[PDB]
Symmetry: D2
Subunit: 116 residues, 4 copies
Amino acid sequence: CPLMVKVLDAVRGSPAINVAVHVFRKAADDTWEPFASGKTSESGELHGLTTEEEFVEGIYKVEIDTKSYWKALGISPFHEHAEVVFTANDSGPRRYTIAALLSPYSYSTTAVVTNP
Amino acid sequence: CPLMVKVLDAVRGSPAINVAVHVFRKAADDTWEPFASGKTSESGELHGLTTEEEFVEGIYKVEIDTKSYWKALGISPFHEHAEVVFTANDSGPRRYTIAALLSPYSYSTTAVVTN
Amino acid sequence: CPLMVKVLDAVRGSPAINVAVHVFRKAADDTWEPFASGKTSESGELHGLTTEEEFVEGIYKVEIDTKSYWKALGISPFHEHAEVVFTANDSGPRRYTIAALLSPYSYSTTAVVTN
Amino acid sequence: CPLMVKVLDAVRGSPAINVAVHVFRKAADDTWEPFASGKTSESGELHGLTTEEEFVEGIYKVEIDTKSYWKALGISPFHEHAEVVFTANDSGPRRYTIAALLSPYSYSTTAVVTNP
Ligand SMILES: O=C(O)C1(c2ccc(-c3ccc(Cl)c(Cl)c3)c(F)c2)CC1
Ligand SMILES: O=C(O)C1(c2ccc(-c3ccc(Cl)c(Cl)c3)c(F)c2)CC1
């Protein structure tokens, strides 16, 4: 699992469950090509997005669908989504965890990058 | 001044000075069209991006060029840029401040929407 | 104005208005002695806490009464208060802004220390 | 494990290893009585602070020793520590995770509170 996403809710004090996440990878022509997608579990974690083979060097965008998540809970939030855009694997394969904490009008994200 | 951007630096404990910020509006074909841009001041603020008449309802993206900011300070950064994407809705209050706190592997952003 | 406090609300997307803030200085016996206090303004800011002559080097605690703030809004909060504890050191720049972003189960704080 | 602490470093993109944490509990007389302490592991996590029996109702302060952590890495940070003060177990036993993300001049903390 070289790409994981963990999301917490700062209003409820809970994992953020059933949050949709789409990952895109910048293509040869400079567009955002769909790469992987999935949704957070009961623990707020999203595993199994990709594999070591498929997760090659590139510029990736991890879009966390915070508006969808908040609307589902009956709340009108500010942002459309939270975006995390970064170059990956440019020194060889790393494992990345993108952690996010969500409020209706704010989010924070950080990355944990490990070398297996 | 319906739209202001204010950026802080969590490593130096200072405003984030001379950071490029580009704002885009989402066009009818779902592409992002340039809307306004500038560099943050000594106080980490960017005023004067737009006028009331120009800032209509719509989806906007504020891209903050964090990677060049950290490289100019000799610090190795994780992100290509930071992006804040939101709907401007006239039912809400009328003045939008997008605020961001930058670290090399992290950022936080919040909106302050007032009258 | 060597010391300013600015507080934002991540749930409402607004300044955090009428929040009580107490500042303490650490005494020689390691107890916290009252130093300054006030309530944030409509803009979420608290100016005028102290003067240059009064604000000496030392360890300070800024306690932000978040629990009463969230209860007055009818929201159930996690924390008793938020606390920011730091050393004021004259070798650094001279003006300290403590900024905080509040949520019911979370808060972030950063320092902006400038000349 | 009803009380856990997880700490990330926003400068390195890593767990924050070997971070000291002291927990205090407000006593009958209104002082802060030492309750438990420990340090984060290689994963940035601190387990085994307390037990279900000992972690009773009360007002707790979790002090994360961020100044010590940064000084050990050769960095002069702003804060003495990060403090998380909250009432616990006042509706019966819950499990709490206090998550923190640290920068030299900033920190963020959130709580995840679960009902076993
Ligand atoms: O296993 C992890 O990585 C978990 C975690 C999830 C989120 C956070 C965290 C805590 C604070 C902030 Cl501001 C952000 Cl962006 C992320 C954290 F510190 C830890 C505990 C869920
Ligand atoms: O005028 C404002 O709004 C300023 C400001 C700029 C940024 C922040 C801020 C502080 C903490 C976090 Cl996590 C975030 Cl996203 C933003 C803040 F609280 C305040 C103080 C300069």
